[PDB]
């Protein structure tokens, strides 16, 4: 439209070069070294780490990149999910 909308950024940003560094096997501390402390984390039950990199340019398409990491109840990764989002709306 016409109304000025300030740029909005809503989560830690992860670069593909850094994404490639993470694979299955490493402990929590190495992941924290690689990407930093996840900004959003699950409080309910299983300890899963969410890395959501979301941007609103302002009167333009909202973009989102989701990285879901599941850590088993020992301190080691089990599986990852690198969704480019952009689904539906």
């Amino acid at each position: 439209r016409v109304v000025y909308r300030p740029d909005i950024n809503q989560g830690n940003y992860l670069t593909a070069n850094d994404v490639s560094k993470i694979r299955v096997g490493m402990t929590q501390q190495q992941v924290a070294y690689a990407l930093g402390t996840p900004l959003m984390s699950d409080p309910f039950g299983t300890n899963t780490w969410f890395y959501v990199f979301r941007q609103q340019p302002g009167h333009e398409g909202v973009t989102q990149q989701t990285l879901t990491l599941t850590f088993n109840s020992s301190g080691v990764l089990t599986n990852i999910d690198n969704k480019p989002a952009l689904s539906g709306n």
Partner: protein, 783 residues
């Protein structure tokens, strides 16, 4: 031997068993007759005693105690340059204050400290003396006597060791003054120890940025005349030699943004090595790294020099760090205005990567609001994870409500008055409300307005305004200039970018005016409307209903919201009647205020104010006279009176018009009425132009603690009002008001102070270029 009990004579600071907590006797053993000395040593070493005397005249231990006195009042005199406010903090810091004990060590410490301070500033013949006068029940009073002799006058500053710059050029820039001009009172010649280091650093930087690299200051002395009157400061330098920047190279754990850092680091070849340029490069590297998230980068610049070819190859080591994130944003001090009206001014969104520029820009926007005195930012890292940080804003809410009471005239009219209130921050809710009403035997008036700046959370601001001015000549509604006017206005505006706003809105107003005086301009307007009334008798009536669509633009890049110190503001407001209204006209007004600073402290400021205005009609219908502009009084050309600049109405021969009381209502009535006669009543034209230049300087009788609440200005002021339409025939024998070169002008001083009743301005104005019918006033008080 055997001791039966322990008895004491100290009763104030000694507790019941805290005394026994230190002795080893325990009243249950034979005494060694020697360890008593160790006991006394320990007891006095506890630090709560002054004299200890053990007696065993009988069979018991009696400890005569002389407890340290408790200071009860603080007296000090003879001091000039050390005010009480700082002295109290200095005494309290060193652990001495009324109500606690006295230690003789702190007395010597305080004497040394104050004597050190005087030796620093320059009162070399000075010595504080602190004496304690005893008072009954074991107390003391502390007295301080100050021999502040005289500041030594620095005589000459010598820079021996220079071979490319004259001494006077160098010593000009020093904060210290070699010789003050004879016929000036610009400064002084006191020697402040801190200013010496400041000037030494200044000289170092000065030689360092014109090219000389291998430059250093060997030794600086402070000689002293053998009378403690003159201080001869001497500086020795190694001049060195010039150099060129061979090429600047960057290295380190640079983040992916290396392109912009390289572009910053580029310098045109052949330049001379400049230290301030290096600091500028480093600072801008830090800013560019901060904008992306790395808020704590380690940047180190090393000038590896080759002293054989006039070459330096700067190496810039960069270590970015980690992309910081803000965990939460907290606000402190907003004790009235609710949390929203702070969180909605932000640009650094919560839960995102720290944009080191967005925080500062948000602080600017908070400051601009106009209802925070001191706003300070503080980005503090959380003591846990490696990359998290909390941004804390500390604000101090200030008064923001303007009041206005008063009287219409001194004569006992009866329950007639004027009122007013305007709240920018009504109950902190963010709404701007304003209501005022004046009732008088002359007029009756009442208006209200309510504006919400954030009707929706983007900036879309919605506002309304109502007013009622049916004053009908409250003196009498019969054979009097009667005017009932009222209408309504609704507007809303949205921002275009961070420094702009556009507003649009509607309104309608109708005016009913009856029993008007006859004069040229009003009759011209009535002729334009399609009316052909008479002149001598005054019984005409005119009712007009106007539906105006109005618009406006607002540019506001201003460093503060209440007599700011830097920036610019432009405010355009226009209105156009829509088709279907009785009157077809359009009006345009422009306002502009620009503040330019000349000093780093932002205390001397050049203010440029200007206002322009043009209005007219459309489709052969003249613009109504009641919308004519005005000038004079405050907020305009200041010094004449409110609404007294411009055209003066020329009355037609008035006689036998309804009721004319004798000795009153003598506007133009006369049994020997001759013809049209010039008067002094101001009517206002439709062309307005005023400008003002102000020099803003600190008030010379105030401290910094109150410095931000008073402002003093020297103004040169000019302005003019004129009519776009004219009659050569009807104004042959009278001055041509259509000529815009008859410019009124004035100058004077203005005092501004923010009182609990609101902002107040006191002004003393002297006109220079005046004209007829000005009734200029020298004093002006306003709220």
């Amino acid at each position: 031997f055997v001791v039966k009990d322990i008895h004491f004579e100290g009763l104030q600071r000694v507790a019941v068993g805290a005394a026994l907590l230190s002795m080893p006797v325990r009243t249950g053993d034979t005494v060694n007759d020697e360890d008593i000395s160790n006991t006394i040593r320990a007891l006095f070493a506890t630090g709560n005693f002054e004299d200890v005397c053990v007696l065993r005249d009988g069979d018991t231990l009696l400890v005569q105690v002389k407890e340290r006195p408790t200071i009860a009042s603080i007296t000090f005199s003879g001091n000039k340059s050390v005010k009480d406010d700082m002295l109290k903090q200095n005494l309290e810091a060193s652990g001495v204050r009324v109500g606690e004990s006295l230690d003789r060590t702190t007395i010597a410490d305080i004497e040394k400290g104050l004597e050190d301070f005087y030796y620093s500033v320059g009162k070399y013949s000075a010595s504080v003396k602190a004496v304690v006068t005893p008072l009954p029940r074991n107390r003391v009073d502390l007295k301080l006597v100050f021999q502040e002799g005289v500041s030594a006058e620095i005589q000459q500053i010598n820079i021996v060791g220079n071979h490319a710059f004259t001494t006077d050029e160098l010593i000009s820039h020093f904060q210290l003054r070699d010789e003050v001009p004879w016929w000036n009172v610009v400064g002084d010649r006191k020697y402040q120890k801190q200013k010496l280091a400041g000037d030494l650093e200044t000289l170092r930087s000065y030689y360092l940025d014109r090219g000389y690299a291998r430059f250093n200051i060997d030794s600086t002395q402070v000689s002293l005349t053998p009378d403690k009157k003159g201080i001869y400061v001497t500086v020795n330098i190694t001049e060195g030699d010039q150099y060129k920047l061979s090429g600047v190279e960057v290295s380190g754990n640079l983040a992916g943004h290396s392109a912009e850092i390289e572009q910053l680091t580029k310098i045109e070849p052949g330049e001379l090595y400049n230290g301030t340029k290096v600091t500028k490069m480093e600072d801008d590297i830090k800013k560019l790294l901060g904008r992306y998230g790395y808020a704590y980068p380690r940047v180190q610049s090393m000038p590896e020099i080759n002293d054989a070819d006039k070459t330096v190859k700067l190496r810039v080591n960069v270590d970015a760090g980690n992309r910081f994130y803000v965990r939460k944003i907290r606000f402190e001090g907003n004790d009235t205005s609710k949390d929203a009206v702070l969180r909605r001014e932000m640009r650094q969104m919560e839960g995102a990567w720290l944009g080191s520029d967005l925080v500062d820009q948000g602080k600017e926007r908070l400051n601009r609001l106009g209802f925070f005195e001191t706003v300070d930012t503080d980005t503090q890292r959380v003591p846990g994870s490696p990359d998290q940080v909390d941004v804390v804003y500390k604000v101090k809410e200030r008064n923001t409500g303007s009041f206005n009471f008063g009287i219409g005239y001194g004569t006992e009219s009866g329950v007639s008055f004027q009122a007013g209130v305007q709240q920018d921050n009504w109950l902190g809710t963010g709404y701007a409300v304003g209501i005022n009403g004046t009732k008088n035997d002359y007029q009756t008036y009442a208006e209200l307005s309510v504006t919400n700046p954030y009707f929706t959370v983007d900036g879309v601001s919605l506002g309304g305004r109502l007013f009622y001015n049916d004053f009908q000549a409250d003196d009498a509604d019969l054979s009097d200039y009667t005017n009932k006017s009222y209408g309504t206005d609704v507007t809303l505006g949205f921002p275009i970018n961070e420094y702009n706003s556009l507003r649009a809105g509607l309104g309608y107003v109708h005016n009913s005016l009856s029993n008007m005086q006859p004069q040229v301009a009003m009759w011209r307007y009535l002729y334009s409307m399609g009316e052909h009334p008479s002149t001598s008798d005054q019984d005409n009536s005119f009712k007009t209903d106007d539906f105006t669509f109005n618009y406006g633009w607002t540019y506001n890049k201003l460093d503060r919201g209440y007599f700011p110190t830097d920036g610019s503001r432009v405010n355009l407001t226009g209105k156009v009647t829509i088709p279907g209204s009785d009157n077809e006209y359009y009006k345009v007004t422009l306002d502009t205020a620009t503040y330019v600073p000349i000093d780093d402290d932002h205390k001397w400021v050049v203010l440029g104010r200007t206002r322009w205005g043009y209005g007219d009609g459309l489709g052969g219908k003249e613009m109504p006279f009641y919308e004519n502009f005005y000038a004079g009084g405050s907020s305009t050309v200041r010094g004449f009176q409110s609404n007294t600049i411009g055209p003066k109405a020329v009355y037609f021969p008035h006689q036998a018009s309804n009721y004319d009381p004798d000795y009153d209502y003598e506007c133009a009535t006369q049994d020997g009425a001759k013809d049209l006669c010039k008067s002094d009543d101001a009517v206002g034209g439709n062309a307005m132009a005023v400008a003002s230049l102000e020099f803003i300087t600190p008030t010379p009788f105030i401290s910094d603690k109150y410095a931000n609440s008073v402002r003093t200005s020297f103004f040169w002021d000019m302005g003019t009002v004129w009519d776009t339409n004219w009659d050569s025939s009807q104004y042959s024998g009278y001055p041509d008001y259509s000529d815009p070169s008859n410019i009124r002008m004035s100058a004077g001083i203005a005092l501004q102070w923010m009182s609990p009743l609101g902002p107040l301005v006191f002004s003393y104005a002297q006109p220079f270029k005046k004209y007829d019918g000005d009734k200029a006033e020298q004093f002006q008080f306003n709220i």
